[PDB]
Structure formats: C-alpha cells, structure tokens
Amino acid sequence: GVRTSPTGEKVTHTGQAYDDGDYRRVRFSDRQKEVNENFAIDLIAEQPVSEVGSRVISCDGGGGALGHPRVYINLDKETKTGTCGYCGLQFRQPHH
Amino acid sequence: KVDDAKVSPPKRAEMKTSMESLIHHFKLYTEGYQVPPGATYTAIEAPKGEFGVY
Amino acid sequence: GTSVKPIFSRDMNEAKRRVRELYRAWYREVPNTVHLFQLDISVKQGRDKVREMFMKNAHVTDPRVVDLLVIKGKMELEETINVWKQRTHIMRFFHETEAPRPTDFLSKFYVGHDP
Amino acid sequence: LGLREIRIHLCQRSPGSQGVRDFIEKRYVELKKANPDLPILIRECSDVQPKLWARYAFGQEKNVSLNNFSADQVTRTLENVLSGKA
Amino acid sequence: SNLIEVFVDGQSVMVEPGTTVLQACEKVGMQIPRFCYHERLSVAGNCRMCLVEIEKAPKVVAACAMPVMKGWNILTNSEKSKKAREGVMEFLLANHPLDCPICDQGGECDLQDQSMMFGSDRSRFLEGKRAVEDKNIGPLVKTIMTRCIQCTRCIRFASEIAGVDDLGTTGRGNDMQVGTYIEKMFMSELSGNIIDICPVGALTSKPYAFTARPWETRKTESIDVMDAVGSNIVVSTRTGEVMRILPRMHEDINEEWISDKTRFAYDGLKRQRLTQPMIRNEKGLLTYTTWEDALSRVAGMLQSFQGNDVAAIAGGLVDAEALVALKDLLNRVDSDSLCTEEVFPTAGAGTDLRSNYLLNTTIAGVEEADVILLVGTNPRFEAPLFNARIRKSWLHNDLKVALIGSPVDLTYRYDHLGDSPKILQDIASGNHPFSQILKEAKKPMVVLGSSALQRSDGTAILAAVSNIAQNIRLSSGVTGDWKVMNILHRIASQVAALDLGYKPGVEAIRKNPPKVLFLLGADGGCITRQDLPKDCFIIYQGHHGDVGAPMADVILPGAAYTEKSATYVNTEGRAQQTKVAVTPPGLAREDWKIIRALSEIAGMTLPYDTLDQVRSRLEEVSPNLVRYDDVEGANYFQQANELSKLVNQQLLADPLVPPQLTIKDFYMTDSISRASQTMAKCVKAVTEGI
Amino acid sequence: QLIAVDEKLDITTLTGVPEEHIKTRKVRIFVPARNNMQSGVNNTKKWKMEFDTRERWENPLMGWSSTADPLSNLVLTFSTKEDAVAFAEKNGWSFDVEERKVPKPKSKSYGANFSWNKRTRVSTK
Amino acid sequence: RFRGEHALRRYPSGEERCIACKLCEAVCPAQAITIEAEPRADGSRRTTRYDIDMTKCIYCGFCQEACPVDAIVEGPNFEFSTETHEELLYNKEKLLNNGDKWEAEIAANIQADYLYR
Amino acid sequence: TRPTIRPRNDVVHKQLSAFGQYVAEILPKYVQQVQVSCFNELEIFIHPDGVIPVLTFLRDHTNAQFKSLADLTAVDVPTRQNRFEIVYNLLSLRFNSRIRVKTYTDELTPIESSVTVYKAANWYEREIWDMFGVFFANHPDLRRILTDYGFEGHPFRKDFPLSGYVELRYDDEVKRVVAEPVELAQEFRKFDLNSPWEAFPAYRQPPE
Amino acid sequence: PTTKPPTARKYIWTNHKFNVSGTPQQYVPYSTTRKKIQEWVPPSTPYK
Numbered sequence A: 001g002v003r004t005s006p007t008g009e010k011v012t013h014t015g016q017a018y019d020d021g022d023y024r025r026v027r028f029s030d031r032q033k034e035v036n037e038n039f040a041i042d043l044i045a046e047q048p049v050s051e052v053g054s055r056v057i058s059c060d061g062g063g064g065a066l067g068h069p070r071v072y073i074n075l076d077k078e079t080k081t082g083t084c085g086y087c088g089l090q091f092r093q094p095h096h
Numbered sequence B: 001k002v003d004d005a006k007v008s009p010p011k012r013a014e015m016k017t018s019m020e021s022l023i024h025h026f027k028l029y030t031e032g033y034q035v036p037p038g039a040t041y042t043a044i045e046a047p048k049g050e051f052g053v054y
Numbered sequence C: 001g002t003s004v005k006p007i008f009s010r011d012m013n014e015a016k017r018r019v020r021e022l023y024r025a026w027y028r029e030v031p032n033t034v035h036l037f038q039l040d041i042s043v044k045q046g047r048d049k050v051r052e053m054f055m056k057n058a059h060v061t062d063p064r065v066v067d068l069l070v071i072k073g074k075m076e077l078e079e080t081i082n083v084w085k086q087r088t089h090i091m092r093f094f095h096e097t098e099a100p101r102p103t104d105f106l107s108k109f110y111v112g113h114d115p
Numbered sequence D: 001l002g003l004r005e006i007r008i009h010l011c012q013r014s015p016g017s018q019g020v021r022d023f024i025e026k027r028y029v030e031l032k033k034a035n036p037d038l039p040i041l042i043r044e045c046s047d048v049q050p051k052l053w054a055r056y057a058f059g060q061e062k063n064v065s066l067n068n069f070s071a072d073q074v075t076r077t078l079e080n081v082l083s084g085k086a
Numbered sequence E: 001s002n003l004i005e006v007f008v009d010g011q012s013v014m015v016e017p018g019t020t021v022l023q024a025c026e027k028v029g030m031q032i033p034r035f036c037y038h039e040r041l042s043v044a045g046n047c048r049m050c051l052v053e054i055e056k057a058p059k060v061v062a063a064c065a066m067p068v069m070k071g072w073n074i075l076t077n078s079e080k081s082k083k084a085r086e087g088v089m090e091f092l093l094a095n096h097p098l099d100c101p102i103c104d105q106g107g108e109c110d111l112q113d114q115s116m117m118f119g120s121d122r123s124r125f126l127e128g129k130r131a132v133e134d135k136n137i138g139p140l141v142k143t144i145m146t147r148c149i150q151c152t153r154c155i156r157f158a159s160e161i162a163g164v165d166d167l168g169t170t171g172r173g174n175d176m177q178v179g180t181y182i183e184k185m186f187m188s189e190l191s192g193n194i195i196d197i198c199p200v201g202a203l204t205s206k207p208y209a210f211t212a213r214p215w216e217t218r219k220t221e222s223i224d225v226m227d228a229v230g231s232n233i234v235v236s237t238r239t240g241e242v243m244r245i246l247p248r249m250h251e252d253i254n255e256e257w258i259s260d261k262t263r264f265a266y267d268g269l270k271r272q273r274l275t276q277p278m279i280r281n282e283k284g285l286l287t288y289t290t291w292e293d294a295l296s297r298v299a300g301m302l303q304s305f306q307g308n309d310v311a312a313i314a315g316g317l318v319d320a321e322a323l324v325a326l327k328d329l330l331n332r333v334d335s336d337s338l339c340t341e342e343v344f345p346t347a348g349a350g351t352d353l354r355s356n357y358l359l360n361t362t363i364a365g366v367e368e369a370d371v372i373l374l375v376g377t378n379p380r381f382e383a384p385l386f387n388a389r390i391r392k393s394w395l396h397n398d399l400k401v402a403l404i405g406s407p408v409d410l411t412y413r414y415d416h417l418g419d420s421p422k423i424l425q426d427i428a429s430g431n432h433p434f435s436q437i438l439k440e441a442k443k444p445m446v447v448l449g450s451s452a453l454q455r456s457d458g459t460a461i462l463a464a465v466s467n468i469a470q471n472i473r474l475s476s477g478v479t480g481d482w483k484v485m486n487i488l489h490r491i492a493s494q495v496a497a498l499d500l501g502y503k504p505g506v507e508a509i510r511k512n513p514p515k516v517l518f519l520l521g522a523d524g525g526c527i528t529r530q531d532l533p534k535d536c537f538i539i540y541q542g543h544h545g546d547v548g549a550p551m552a553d554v555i556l557p558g559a560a561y562t563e564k565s566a567t568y569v570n571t572e573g574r575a576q577q578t579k580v581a582v583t584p585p586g587l588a589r590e591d592w593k594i595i596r597a598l599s600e601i602a603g604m605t606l607p608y609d610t611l612d613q614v615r616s617r618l619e620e621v622s623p624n625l626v627r628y629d630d631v632e633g634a635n636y637f638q639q640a641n642e643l644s645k646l647v648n649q650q651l652l653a654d655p656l657v658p659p660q661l662t663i664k665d666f667y668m669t670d671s672i673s674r675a676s677q678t679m680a681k682c683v684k685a686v687t688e689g690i
Numbered sequence F: 001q002l003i004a005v006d007e008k009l010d011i012t013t014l015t016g017v018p019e020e021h022i023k024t025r026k027v028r029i030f031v032p033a034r035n036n037m038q039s040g041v042n043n044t045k046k047w048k049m050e051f052d053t054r055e056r057w058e059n060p061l062m063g064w065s066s067t068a069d070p071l072s073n074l075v076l077t078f079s080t081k082e083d084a085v086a087f088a089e090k091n092g093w094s095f096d097v098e099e100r101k102v103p104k105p106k107s108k109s110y111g112a113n114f115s116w117n118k119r120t121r122v123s124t125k
Numbered sequence G: 001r002f003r004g005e006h007a008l009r010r011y012p013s014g015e016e017r018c019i020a021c022k023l024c025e026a027v028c029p030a031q032a033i034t035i036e037a038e039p040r041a042d043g044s045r046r047t048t049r050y051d052i053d054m055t056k057c058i059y060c061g062f063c064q065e066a067c068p069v070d071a072i073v074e075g076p077n078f079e080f081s082t083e084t085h086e087e088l089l090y091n092k093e094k095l096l097n098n099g100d101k102w103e104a105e106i107a108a109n110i111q112a113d114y115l116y117r
Numbered sequence H: 001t002r003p004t005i006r007p008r009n010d011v012v013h014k015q016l017s018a019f020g021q022y023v024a025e026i027l028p029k030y031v032q033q034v035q036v037s038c039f040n041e042l043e044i045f046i047h048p049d050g051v052i053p054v055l056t057f058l059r060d061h062t063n064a065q066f067k068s069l070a071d072l073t074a075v076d077v078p079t080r081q082n083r084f085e086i087v088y089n090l091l092s093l094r095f096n097s098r099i100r101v102k103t104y105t106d107e108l109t110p111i112e113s114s115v116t117v118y119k120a121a122n123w124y125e126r127e128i129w130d131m132f133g134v135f136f137a138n139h140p141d142l143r144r145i146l147t148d149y150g151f152e153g154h155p156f157r158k159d160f161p162l163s164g165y166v167e168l169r170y171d172d173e174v175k176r177v178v179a180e181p182v183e184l185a186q187e188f189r190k191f192d193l194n195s196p197w198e199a200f201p202a203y204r205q206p207p208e
Numbered sequence I: 001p002t003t004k005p006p007t008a009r010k011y012i013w014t015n016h017k018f019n020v021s022g023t024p025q026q027y028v029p030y031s032t033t034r035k036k037i038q039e040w041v042p043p044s045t046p047y048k
C-alpha cells in the first residue's frame, strides 16, 4: 500500500518519508530508496474471519511447530472478534 | 544436551507448546543461566598443546 | 609509619636524581630521533616537548609514583631508541590533527552541553 | 551604600549560635516592626560557624561573623549595619 | 524486653511478638517467594507460594500470614518447602498463556523469575487452557486478563490505598475473574500504581506498550517536579530518549507510589519544545537565530535600563540554581523586582521566617496526629501523595479529619464544618464545638493550602488560622516539638524561591510596571501586555511553547527537569536534586548557564562558572539548599504570631473554593502536562465515558 | 626496609586517563533502588559507582545513537560505601554519596482484616 | 543448515512473523541488531526499526535460534558482496525484501531441518 | 541425581586436602590459607613475600615436583584495598596433579619476579604488567607485550573503558596514521541482566 | 524444482533480481523511524 509524498518519495509501511526541507534526500540521488511493496497490515486485513462453535479457540499460526506458540482466545464478546496476538487472524461465534 | 532446561534450551516444539519451556527459553536467551561462584582451571589436550581457561 | 615498601627510591631526593638522569637521556636522544625518524620538526621543538611531558606531572610528591613514572619514561625511551616506534607514534605527542578546544565559559556554552 | 537585605545564618543547636538564638527569640520582633519593609532572612547553618550577611545596591555585599557573640553584641553589630557606619 | 527467639535454619533471631514467618526470615537476609503478599497491603494468603516447613510440624505454614512462635525452627530450603514451591508454581503455570514474547512484563516478570528460581523446568499439563475476555478500565491501564494469576493485589490497593471500591472478583473457582462486572473506568489520581503492583502482564501501561524491554533501559534516579511533594522517581531511558517513569521508594515522602500525572505526563516533554533561540523580525514574527544574536539583544536592553525598570517572574518548574543566578543578575542592575506567580502573604514575618511558609509537621508526621483540620485545600489533587498519607493515617490510626471549604470528595470520610471563612473566626474565638475538639487533642494538625492564599483576603485568612494554632498551643500547652502550624504548597519552585528572597506574588510588577521583563518559565498568564506599558521588552526562558512564549520578543530555550542536575525544595522544606537523564534537545541549554552567559555578555559577569560554584553561591544565600535530605528546622511560630496579630484586614464573604473541584481539572495544570497527549486522553475519558 | 611515606594516595598520573575525564567528571556512589516492577531485592545489596550522563545524538546514517564520552557505560561494584569512596578518591574523581535506603519494618496482622470496631476491616477478599 | 544472508519472514497470509520481542537483539553476541517498536494502527505488536549491521555480524545464527516464531533466519545466499560499506547496513525494508526474494528456498530449507531443532 | 549431575570423586578430594595440610605445615611463614574446592581443585593463599620460597619449594621438593608453570595471570577486584590478585597454576607430571598459588598486591607495591624459578614466567609477567600495571622486581626485560607502542593505561582494569580513550585513522594532510579521542557512531548498549531474585542459597552472605 | 516445485505465495517475488551493487538500483540505507521531538510552531500573526 505505497502512496507517494508531495516530493515524489515513496512512503514506507512504518510511514517514514523525508520532508522537503531535509537534506538527507541527497543520498537517493542517482540511486533509489528501498521500499517493501507488501504492506502486512493490508494483507492481514484481507483475511476472512473464521466462525467456530466454541467460546474458546486455539491458534498456533499453522504448520504446527512451524508457527507461533499456541495460545487460546476467548470469544464471549458478541460485538467484536478475537484476534491472535501473534498471527493477527480473527475468530468469532456465529451471530444473528 | 543435558535434560535440564535451566541450562540447556528446550526444543522448539516444547517452547511453542508448554508454558515452562517458553519461560525457560525466554530467560536463557535474554539473561542466560547463572553459574555458581567459584574459579576453575580446565585444560584439554589441544592439537597445538595444552589449552586452558582460568 | 604507614608501613610501605619502595620500588627503587627511599625518599624524594633519590627519585629526583633518577628523574634528572632520565631527563638527561631523553635530551641527548632527541637529535638522533629527529635524524632517524625523518621528522619535520626541529630539535628545539623536540626538547620543548620533552620538557613539557616532564612538567605535565611535576606536582607528584609520592616517591613510589615518581619511581613508576621514571620506569615508564625509560620504557618509552627504549621504544624510541630501538625504532620499535614509528613516525606516527613519535608525532602523536604533538596532536597535529586535533582542532583546538576552547577553555573559556562562553565558547563552551556556544558549542555544546559539556562543562 | 543602600542596604537592601539582611541575612542571618544561625545553627540550630551549636554552642556558638546560642547568642544568635537568644537574640532571635527575644529582640527580633521589635526590629521587624521597626523596619516593616526590610527583608531579614533567617536561615540555618551547618556545623561551620554563625554569620550575618548584608546586601547593598548593585549587588554589593559583605559578611560579618557572629561566632560566640551574645545577644547584646549581635544587636550592636546589627544596628551598626543598619546605619551609615562600617 | 518482650522479644522472643526463633530460629531460621538453625540461626537464632530475636523478634517482636506478632512478627510473621516471612519477616523473621528476612531479618537474616532470606527473601521468601511471594505473589499475593505486599508489605504495604493487607495480608491475603491466597497464592500459597510462601509455604514453608516448620521443624517437627507435619503441615507447611503460610509465611506471609503466620506469626512466629518461640523456639520455632523455620526450614526455608528443606525438601518439603521446595516441593511445595514446585507444586504451587506448576498450578500457577497450568493455565497461564504462552504470551512472554508479546507480553510487556517479559524480562521483569515475577512469575518468570520465580519459575526459573523455584519451579520445575518442564510441564506435564496435557489439557487446554482457559481464556477470559478483556476489560476496559480507562485509557491509562491496559488490561489482558488471561494472564491474571488472581493475586488480588489490585483489589486491595484500590480499596485501601486509593479508597476506590470499583475492583473485585465475580464468579467462583476456575471461572472467578477480576474486574468491575460493568463497563466502568477505574479513574483515580493513583490508578497507575496497579500496573506496578500487578506481578504479571495482566495490568500494564498503555502509553508504554511495546516500546522497550527492561534489559535495554538505563536507569536515572531523580525527583518529580509536577507538584510540591517531590516524589522520588526513576527515569528509564534508552538511546537518548525518555521511555517511562517509575516510582522510587522513599519512606518519608512518596514511599512506593507516584501520582498519575507524575507517571504519565512525561510524554509532554516530547512535543511543543523550544529548541532554538528566537527573535522578532521586521514583520513582528518570531524567527530562529543564533545564541549570540539573542544574547546580544537581551544584554543591550538590559544595559539600557536600570533599577525598577527591570523585572522578572519565576514559573512553577524553576530550579534553585537558575533562581539564584537570575536574582544575582538583577541585583547587579540594582533591581529587586524578582517575583513568583504563586502568592504568599507578606504581612508581619512573611518570608523572613522559614517556618511561616512550610509544612512543619512533615509528610511522615501525619502518621502521629489524631486531629487534622484542612482549610481551603483539595489535597487529593494538589498533593496526591500527601492525601494518600492522610488516608493511611485515617485507616490505620483512626485519625479524625475535618475540612473547611467546599465538600470535595477526599476518598475517606471527613467532618464538614462549612465553606464560609467565618467558621475560622468562630473556631479561633472558642465558640465552636471543633474548638473544643482541638483543645482536647494530644497531637493536633492544622493545614492551610496555598490555593486559598490566592484570594485578596488570603492574608487575613493566614492570621485567622495562626490564631487557631496559638489558641491550641496555649490551652493544650506545649507538647514539645509538634508544630501544629502547616502550609501545603502545590508548586515545585515555590519554597526554593521563598528561601532565596524572591518576592512572593506579582503585585510589585503591577504597582511598578517595568520596561524589561524576564519570564523564567512563567506560563500562568498572571501578567499580559495590558498590565505592561507598550513597547515593553519581554524575554522568555523555558522549555515549552505555552502562554508565555508568543508574547515575548526574545526566546531562550532551556532544559526540562529530565535534562539537568537541578535543586528543588519540597513543601516540607526538604531539598532534593535531580540528575541528567537525557541532554536538552537542539540548542537548548542549562538555565543557570544561559543566565551566566548573558551576564558575561552584558558586562556584569557572575563569579560562578561550574555547577559546584553555583551551589556554593546557593549555600551562601541559604545554607539549607545544599543539605540534600535534611528536613529538620527551627520553629519560630511565636514571633510570626506576634508579627501577624498586628494587622487586622477583614475576611471576604466568599466560600473557599479549590481551583480543581473535580478529577478532570487535575490532569492538566502546568506546561508539561498541557502538552501531554495522555493527559488529554484522560480528560476526554473523564468528561465522557463512551 | 620501609620508607614510611606520609602523603595522600594519588594514582591519576599512572592510569593514562585524559585530563578532561578526571577533573570534569562527577561519579555517584549509591545503592540502586529496587525496580518497582518486581518484589525481588537481590539487586539492592551492593554499592554502585557510575559517571555523569553526557550527550547522545542521532547518527545521520541509520539514525543510531552516538556518543563521545568513553565512560558512558562504566559501572563499578563495591562491598561497602567506604571502599567506593576510597576508590574514587585515589582515582581523583569528585563524588556524591547517597546513604542507603532500607524499608522500615512493618506490623502485619491477618486478624486485623476482620476487626470489630476499627477501620482496618476489609470489605472483600 | 548453512548460515547465509539474513531475511525476515511472513505468515502464509502475508502478515509479518516478527512481534518485536527483542530476543534476537538480546542474544546477539556482536550487538549487530537494533530494534524499535510501537503498536500498529490496528493494535498489532510490530517493529518500526529492524536494523542489522552486517559488518558487525559474526553469522553465528543465535538470532534464529532465539526467535520464537521463526521470523529472523539466515538464508542460503552467500554471494552479496558490495562496492561500498553503506550497502551492508540493512534496515527493515531490505530484510523484508530479502525474505520475499528467498522464501521459496528458505521454507524448503526449514522443512528439512526443523525436526532436528 | 544420577543422569544430569556431575559425579564427585571423594578419593581425590582427600588426597588434595592432605597435601594442602602438608604444604601449610612445611611453610607456616607464608601460608595464610589452604582450600580445596568441591570439583577437586586445591588453592594455597600466601603472603606476597613468600612468592619465591613457596614456588621454589613446590618445584624442587621430592614430594611436590610441580616443574611446569601452566599459567600466570591477574584478577582485578576494585573493592579490595589490595586491588590485584596474582594466580599461579602449576602442574606436576611426577604425581599427575595440579595446584594453584595465590597472592595479592596493589598499584604501588612490586611483586618479586619468578623468572629464576620458572623460565616460562618471563612473558606472563610482561603481560600482567601491560594489562594491569603490576610491577615485578628484578625482571630481565620488563616492557609492554600486547598493547600498541606508546599506549597509555592498563586495559584489563575494571575502571578502564571497554572502547578505550583514543582511536586510529589515516589522515591525508599529515600523510600518516593519527590518534584521536574515541567517537562512536553507535554507542555500546549496556544491558542490566541480573535477576532480583537470589539464585544460590548456599552462597548467601550475612546481612551485615 | 521441476519435479518438486516450491510452495506458491502471494508475496514471493515473481522476478528474480541479481546483485545490483554498483548500479543505480543499489540499496541505500536510511532510518525508518519518525521524528522524536516536535518543535513549537510560533504564531503567524503579530503580537502588538
């Protein structure tokens, strides 16, 4: 999700962009500013919400021992979704 | 490695499955294990001669 | 009493004699150092630097400290005479590439926070 | 020449500060109501000695020792300070 | 005398009766594992981690709640004690979440460290864990309840220390949870301490989240300047940046806590800072310039005028060094118009006697009084730690508290006499029942707040309060050295200014409007340009952009309290010093250094060049400012009363009203906390829940 | 035999330290305060000596934290306050000493939680 | 098991694996890793700075052992010589680009060794 | 207790204790303490004046015969009045045993050179002088061994900074390598790792 | 990889790049964090 700045400089996922006044932009002359193209926030926002039939669900990130430590998520709040603190995947209970 | 998680790190599956293993992995990779006070001179037969550590 | 043991000297007089002997040796050596190392300084500059190095710790009143200082001076003289030292080591005594650091309050206030 | 402030540094329980303590306990109030617009700052010293400070115009000041002085002596020197002498 | 003998691992210890096993063990340097026991809170006994074996006793005892008995032999390192510790740690870790890499507690966690030191190294739990839902208790304390170990430390702190009963437990057994059972923000002036007391990552700081690890931080020990309590703190820094503020234990003062403004307003320092010298250009706009140019302009305008024309005002966060330097500089110009924004009555003794304007009893002395009278004060917001000490004495010593003023909520029950100041005269004349109550009290205390001395009739009020203290000292005699008379300050720079001879108030400026004004961190808005003649030269020295900066002609950037070694004087009269944690940003400098450099430019150079020389000057002017923990001083109440009873100005028919009536007006009071985004969030949260 | 010196110990000329980092430094002799996040007290047993904090600035490249004073990380450990004072004095550094802070003993009573007439009674457990 | 140029990895959804625990920074024997972090706009625990000085690194592989989510790895690449010193001071963008570039091989290498770990 | 715990040899422990008692009996003029560690290492604490007699006895006695100097080094403990601890590690080929001899000194008190007793000691003493500043009397040729020519200070002392006081670079104006005060692009980051909870009860100190 | 293809991911590069050191595409390092201290902005209107 790269957007350009008024000076034409690409904006990183962290949000750092040099100001017009700043002299440090000279380091990119005749060269390029390295920016990763895959914003992880937009990618994780694209994942669908899982629906499960229990008050507590477990997430390990997938792949067993190739994921993150296994944690358990409470799903009692009806007007929200439980989010894994490692992976960012969302879970909920079937409503309406 | 010695089956003592307060010295040797546990396996990755254990660290990702059980609470004690994760705590011990965290502490061994951030602070490290404490060694009791004392002094030793240990020497081996290295290929170039006697190699020692005080 | 304070029950202390010496290194070489018993009181300050013997220590001063050793200091004078070391000063004589360095003063004699300076011209040979200028010749061998191909220094662009004069012999007068070298002897002034030797005198300044000696005066840098003229306030010492402990004979043991003076004894150790003389031992270190002899070590440095041995390094210079045998050419273990290089031209860069000899010229480090003069600080030729260091910009002067002002000592009054106003300049220190202008440049930074250091006292 | 123009006095601006008076400072007295007396210690809490030193034997030498006994006279200044007695003076403050007895005759300070009279002096204060005699000079209702003069700062007389009472402060506490550490174990060194008692003292009295007098400040004049343009930042000039000098100090006089009050060690072992009695109340009469400190009153004397204080009223010498509050007049154009010494 | 009545000491008994007990043995800890075969070593004889003599202890007072009622001493617990844990205390007997720590008498010889052995710290027992604990999770629910806090030495400043009620004993709970719930965690069970403190279980130890007593010799010849089949059952282990809870060291935190069991009184030692004569001849007992505690065995802190026996097999039974170690096995009890291992079992309890196993039960604690069974349902705990694998959250250490995402937990802010990681690296400074009691659960982690005690698992490493007293528990096993592996798990045999083969079931699924529980997970509870999270709670919202405000914008300050982050809540992740799954990590809770049910210590109940937060509930006890809220009930006993903060006086707020909003925290509790619902349900039973495994399902039991800690919270409020409804959506309700736990908002208190001391609320942020539950983060410190919570041993796990269940309660954490929300402004601090995810920003640092404990092994990274460098610790600097300094003093808090957000009020006149002078709480001891630790500044955590990493790579030249302030990361957070932590309490530092000082038994006489704060003890183990800090107020929420002390803890969370540090973010204020980051924004709206003066970093370069500024002057006015042709268009009347402020423009960046060098130090030399601004100093030259100020020196020229200082040489241009003399005596009464030159004036200065000191703000609420100024240190002693800068105050004495500015006083000396203005004295060289033959000026005495050195003033502070906070007003103290000048009638009679005034600032001449140190006892007249100080809290004589002291913070630790509150624990000995049995009757305290508060007049025109809101201690909870003005001095939250002083109010906490009052509540501690109310809870543990049955202290009787009465208030004169508007009925604020103080978190404890007090007796309300009224708000009309006529009650002061009724008590003084003996025509009040509370006069009889004070007459019979062995160790009475009367506390008058500095916020009630801000009124026009404030000087009369001081005399009335003094009359009450004289009546108490007369009828009840002399209890020795009790110092019934007290004054409670709310500004960190006030007492040091008073010690230095600075004129209290600001009326001298109004009666003699100057042409050259010095604003040393003065952001109270007491004097605008209406009160001054036109084309007047105004110089502002500070660290923030606030009320006083846009009205000035020259701006000199100074250092905040985290960026210098400075001297501050407490309300009690104790003098404490800060330490440099991070250097001042940009071109900002130390304040006394700025004043000394300006004096050199102006030609009237000051004698002192280093900080030690400035502190020698401070010793010359007032020797109590270099005694860095001393709080004992002579008492001159009798002379002050004599000099105060000669002027008889009348009171005012206006009920005493504290400046901060409610919690919302507590958060933003000074320059730093006005620039804090966390304080703005707190104000928004208290004015609307949502 | 012995020589019986009667001077004061001063080794500054032998340590090789530059003159700036001897006269302008101020060390602090103190026992570190307990980290308020933990209940353990094992880090408040020894005395510590550290130097005054100097300037740190941002590196133009990479934005790292730069320093120019060599003593920014030096921390010493001593058994007693007198040992630290002696070390600082013989090394020529000026110092400030802070007296050790100890938590005062407290009177704990589990029965006070349920008092008949006192305010110590607790509403909840 | 070969230890090469470093990389930062993602979950299959594209979300980053790194959670700013700073274990790799703590364990690094050369102090070659510098990390800063803050809550992301959606509340996630993510870094804002992740720098590795490759002229400080000893290529010991301790960082990838310490990582609890396999976020930082030493990838198989070893042909990355540069013409200037500054090209070897990696920031977060460079490491993420390396991860996206070498994931196809890194995942296969991890699949072949994780049972020994 | 069986699989993960290192085994302890009682017979060796008894022999080393008896030999320590033997050495202490033979040289009461210099021996201040004799200790045997639980992992079977014997230490002998002596007065500095007994460096030469003790080492000579341990080298030449028929029942000792520690003819090889394995290692000689120093340890700096700033909290002690005598700052420096001198450690000799000796190995006996005849009896297949090792021994450790310890003494102490401060900045201004020389220690006698042990070069006459052991040829190997000449370099070790030079390293001790270079790294710690301990002077050895009657050394054949005492001078710096490890540090750069003209280097000032002793870097192994606790007070000495890790990165030193000066750095080196090449300067084109003077066309040589120059030394200047250290400036670091990234400051070394200090870590506070020690746990606030005690680890080893067997080593707890009395509360003074 | 013909017999054993790698796993397909949406973020893996579809175009391999070689060593670009010494070219205009070379990597240039920079700080990825935002400003720490915000300065005070003086008012744009006169004061008298």
Ligand code: SF4
Pocket: B023, E096, E097, E098, E099, E100, E103, E104, E105, E106, E107, E109, E110, E111, E112, E147, E199, E200, E201, E202
């Ligand atoms: S509070 Fe729990 S999750 Fe957090 S570090 Fe401690 S043990 Fe780990």
Ligand code: SF4
Pocket: E147, E148, E149, E150, E151, E152, E153, E154, E155, E178, E197, E198, E199, E200, E202, E203
């Ligand atoms: S939130 Fe913290 S203090 Fe409160 S019960 Fe849970 S663990 Fe204990």
Ligand code: SF4
Pocket: G024, G027, G028, G029, G030, G031, G032, G033, G052, G056, G057, G058, G059, G060, G061, G062, G063, G064
């Ligand atoms: S491989 Fe080793 S030296 Fe290199 S970054 Fe990882 S931990 Fe540090």
Ligand code: SF4
Pocket: G017, G018, G019, G020, G021, G022, G023, G024, G025, G035, G063, G066, G067, G068, G069, G070, G071, G072
């Ligand atoms: S790379 Fe791994 S170890 Fe390093 S901070 Fe990120 S999650 Fe922690």
Ligand code: FES
Pocket: E033, E034, E035, E036, E037, E044, E045, E046, E047, E048, E049, E050, E051, E062, E063, E064, E065
């Ligand atoms: S500390 Fe005693 S039961 Fe919790």
Ligand SMILES: [Mg+2]
Pocket: E105, E194, E195, E196, E197, E198, E199, E200, E201, E202, E203, E204
């Ligand atoms: Mg907590």
Ligand SMILES: [Zn+2]
Pocket: A059, A060, A061, A068, A084, A085, A086, A087, A088, A089
């Ligand atoms: Zn997940």
